[PDB]
Design a protein around this nucleic acid. Sequence first.
RNA 1: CAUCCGGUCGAUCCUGCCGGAGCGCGACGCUCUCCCCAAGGACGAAGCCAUGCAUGCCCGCUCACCCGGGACGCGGCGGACGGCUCAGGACAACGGUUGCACCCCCCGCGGCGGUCCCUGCUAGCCGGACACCGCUGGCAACCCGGCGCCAAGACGUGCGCGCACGGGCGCGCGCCCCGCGGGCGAGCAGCGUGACGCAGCGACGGCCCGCCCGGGCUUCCGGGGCAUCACCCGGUCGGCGCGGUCGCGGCGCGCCGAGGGCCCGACGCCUGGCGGAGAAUCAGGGUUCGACUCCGGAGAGCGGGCCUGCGAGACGGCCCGCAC
RNA 2: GACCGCAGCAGGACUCCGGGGUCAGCAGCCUCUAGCGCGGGAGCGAACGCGGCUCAGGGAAGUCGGCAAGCCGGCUCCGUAACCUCGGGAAAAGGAGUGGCUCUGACGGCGCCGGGUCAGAACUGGAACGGACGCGGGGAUCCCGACUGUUUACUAGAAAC
Lengths: 173, 153, 99, 135
Amino acid sequence: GITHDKMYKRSKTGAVQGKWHKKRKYNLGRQPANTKLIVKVTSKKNEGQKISTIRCRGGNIKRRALRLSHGSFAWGSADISHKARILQVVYNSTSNELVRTNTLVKGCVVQIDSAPFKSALSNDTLDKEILDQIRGDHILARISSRPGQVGTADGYILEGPELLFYQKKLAPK
Amino acid sequence: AENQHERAYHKQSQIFQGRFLRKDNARCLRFYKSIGMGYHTPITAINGTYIDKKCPFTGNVSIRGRILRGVVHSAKMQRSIIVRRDYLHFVQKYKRYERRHKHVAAHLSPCFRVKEGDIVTIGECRPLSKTIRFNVIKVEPVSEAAKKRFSPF
Amino acid sequence: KSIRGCIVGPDLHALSVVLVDAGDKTLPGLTDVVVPKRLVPKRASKIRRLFGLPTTKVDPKDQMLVCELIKELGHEVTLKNGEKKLKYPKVQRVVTDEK
Amino acid sequence: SGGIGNKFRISCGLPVGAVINCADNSGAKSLNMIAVKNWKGHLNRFPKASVGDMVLITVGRDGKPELRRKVTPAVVVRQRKVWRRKDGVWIYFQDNAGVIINPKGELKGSSITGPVAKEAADRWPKISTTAECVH
RNA sequence: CAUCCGGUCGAUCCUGCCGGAGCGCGACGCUCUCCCCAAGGACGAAGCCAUGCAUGCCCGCUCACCCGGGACGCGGCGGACGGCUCAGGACAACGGUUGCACCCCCCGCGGCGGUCCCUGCUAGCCGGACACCGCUGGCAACCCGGCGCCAAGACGUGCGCGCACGGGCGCGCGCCCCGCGGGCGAGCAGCGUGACGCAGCGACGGCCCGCCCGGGCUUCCGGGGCAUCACCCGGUCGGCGCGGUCGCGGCGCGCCGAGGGCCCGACGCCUGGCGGAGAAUCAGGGUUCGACUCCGGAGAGCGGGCCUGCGAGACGGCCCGCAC
RNA sequence: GACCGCAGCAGGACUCCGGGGUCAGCAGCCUCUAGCGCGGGAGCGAACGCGGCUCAGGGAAGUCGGCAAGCCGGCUCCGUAACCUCGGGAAAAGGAGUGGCUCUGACGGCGCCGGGUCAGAACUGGAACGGACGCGGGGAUCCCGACUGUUUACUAGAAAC
């Protein structure tokens, strides 16, 4: 397998250790998942959001980021949550190339739709910055769940001077 | 929090950075996990913007094993120090000894900055990185220049 | 393994067909021969179907058996011709007191 | 004889002084042509070889030491210049190549690498059986 | 278990090495009336293998021109055990010491055994669908051609207690140190809240957690020679994110900062280099060898990849490159 | 533009001043200024020359010999041996890029102004970039002379001087 073994890496002093044996199945590595997010299904129907379960050591079952576009967010302040399909991947931060293919990454800042979260405007001015994001149908949030290992699209909502730090980049930079 | 040089914001993962927004009052702003073996933490390490996931006092790291000690020679690596322990080996053929030495790396946090020539304990921990497996806890700076003398402490 | 192409070539050794709708003129020695099917339905689900009782659903009667008098494999050394016991393919798929 | 059968003439592209590639697993990296068998030369005519013409070649310094400094019979499998078979199809092989064959036709090594032309196969059978593809 | 003596000369007294003398292991040679216990292709051939055998065992489901002896297959489990050889491999393998609050596991064993249902429902039992076979196919063999019925302790649909209960989430202790209990040495687990969601098994209801277990990393102290090898590494070395794995990790993949390690000999090179428990011979002090019992590591001509599974990169699994 | 070569002869004759554009350039290739259309013209596009251009496949096998053609080249950036009079070889050898656009950084003076040089990026061109022009083929040795220099104007430029 595409192993992940210490012997393959050089020693700290720069020694190149010859591997004692061949590569091992419990040290096996797998295909990095490139997640697919649909801006619109529109006329085409060939692609749908499908998830992959894979064989693992010990029989454990792993859900994967095969095709995930629908997304869930729980307002930290409210503790209530709403589920819809998120707009796309906006701030991978590791690479801007990943954003183009909408490859989802754990806790990568994304573009969030407000199809069921428009209800926030009914409460009086809760998170006015979120209120300005919710009516627009475009928000910022980090999908804080592991997509490749556990196939999860549930995520937190961005609130706090952390959202402002990201927003300063998200607005013109 | 308002600075815009770092490509990304860094926060304590255990506390939601969203938990506190306005009129902060009854919530705990910093997650601190008390370390094992009862080594005291200076209030300097409890207060600050230091996250340092590698640091045990704040961040998700816990010490699980022996607590060796050595002296700090290098602190250039980012947030990392190389401590040298000395082992005196008894050889039987000649009952005289050899002062073989080892340089081991750990993770320091800005909460306890180190001077040169200090006694720094390293805690057996989760394998942090390729060379990193230890973490600093107690620092005792020695006056002037401590040199070596091959002292194991 | 090498697999022969589906479209035919010039060989004479191997080929095989089926008649989707043989019409009239089924051959006396070939297609016409209508032969009974051996291994007659042996399950209660098949008993409520081809065997003969389709609308029964779960069967109150429970057991339907077309006796099989056939002997079993090798006999002539023993010469017990008189005991061709009339067993059935075992009846099954019923919730007996045991279930 | 060893080359057996009748070949319709196909356009001949490799003259003498040509280093055709060698695709055999015998390990001869490259073969330099010396002559083509059965060539009645006209005045000032370099002898030339088509696909499937037995040629005597000498292995170069790159090739294994044992086969060097000797004339070895070979059969050209691929010729770059397009050749017209009687079907009227015009076919051109990507790179000039040869396989070392016995006077009998037994190859020095079993494997033939890459494509083999159909004219080489009729004249020389062992190549035909071991050909990965007969294009 | 603390030792000699023949030899430089005309002699002597020496240093110094040569030689015997002791003892073990294998050759070899000369040879055997014994008897008993016994190593046995380790030795620059981990060279090639002709010829046989070396992981097989029970039919729940039998309807087979039988009998109470049951073929066969579907299935069930074992062939990841063993046996063998040490080729490769020099902070590795390896002995002991740590931890895994960075982690998987089949057998067995002690608990749990509520499982909403949107849909279809027969829920006191639903499907259609394959082998065996029956009939007729090829080839030089290998190899397995169709059709026709037909069952499962076979495979699949699905009933059932929204304190449903699959994970994984999102989110909720603290208040300068320390004690409390489901807690530890360590604030770790769990619960609650909110969103999903479809794991159970179930057509003869067994999922789950432990214990063991065998792994998988890992911490220290050890772990060949060579300086007619002195400066070396460039993911190299620290962070910062992320992917990936049973899993931590440069392990990978992005992003940065310039680090690492060295005369206590780094890096390099070589090894007719498997390490240890051990073995040899000796007062002590040593020296020498560790392939063979056992213990761990490797590897099945050679490199790669992959399946099946709870675990193998298995090789009397597979598939390719290369030889033969 | 009339001198001297029998002549109104693709020959030899000394300087003065020397615009723009690409470009390193008083280069090449175009151009303002300034001159000016030469021992004449039309057909016809045979052989054969003379001055170029290209060629499938292979390539020195041609030949006395790679003669001649051809290959290479500008720029930037790595990488650069043996030998050695340690100065060289060395442009050794061997690679990578180069276009047009959209832009961002370094330097003299804010109160407005200097100058285009270099880097660094995107985005795009049938998979193209020194796109014309100018513009090394390279390595292995051996033999003579050390070389910079001079030579038999009208057959020998060397190993000769």
